[PDB]
Curated annotation (Swiss-Prot):
The lineage of its organism: Bacteria, Thermotogati, Deinococcota, Deinococci, Thermales. This is Cytochrome c oxidase subunit 2. It is found in: Cell membrane. GO terms for cellular component: plasma membrane. It is a peripheral membrane protein. CDD domains: ba3_CcO_II_C. It comes from Thermus thermophilus. Its EC number is 7.1.1.9.
Length: 122
């Protein structure tokens, strides 16, 4: 369906799975990692996102401020990030390297330079 759906935008940064960025990547299965991503103006947390190749990655993305976009360059990952809502996208990276995350939802003056990075390890 699935897990995360609704969240509180006012406390997302201090209580819960997105509050501590050191803990953003959580193993949730024998070959599966959940990554709690905060899309905010203007950037992504954590940065970089580090994940192993071949593992199913479950991205859980929300915003503490306005609507953003979460698009990973070179992939079909393309989702809307709404405040108060959790966007869930599942993906298995099968090539190591650095991927760029870009915002494709105009979110204010820093929109252009709102970028993130995912490093897929070997
Ligand atoms: Cu975030 Cu545009
Ligand atoms: Zn693209």
């Amino acid at each position: 369906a699935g897990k995360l759906e609704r969240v509180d935008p006012t406390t997302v940064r201090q209580e819960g799975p997105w509050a501590d960025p050191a803990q953003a990547v959580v193993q949730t299965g024998p070959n599966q990692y959940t990554v709690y991503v905060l899309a905010f103006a203007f950037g992504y947390q954590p940065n970089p996102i580090e994940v192993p190749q071949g593992a199913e990655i479950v991205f859980k993305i929300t915003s503490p401020d306005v609507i953003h976009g979460f698009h990973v360059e070179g992939t079909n990952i393309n989702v809307e990030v709404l405040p108060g809502e959790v966007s869930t996208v599942r993906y298995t990276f099968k090539r190591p390297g650095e991927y760029r995350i870009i915002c494709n939802q105009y979110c204010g003056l820093g929109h252009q330079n709102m970028f993130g990075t995912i490093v897929v390890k070997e």
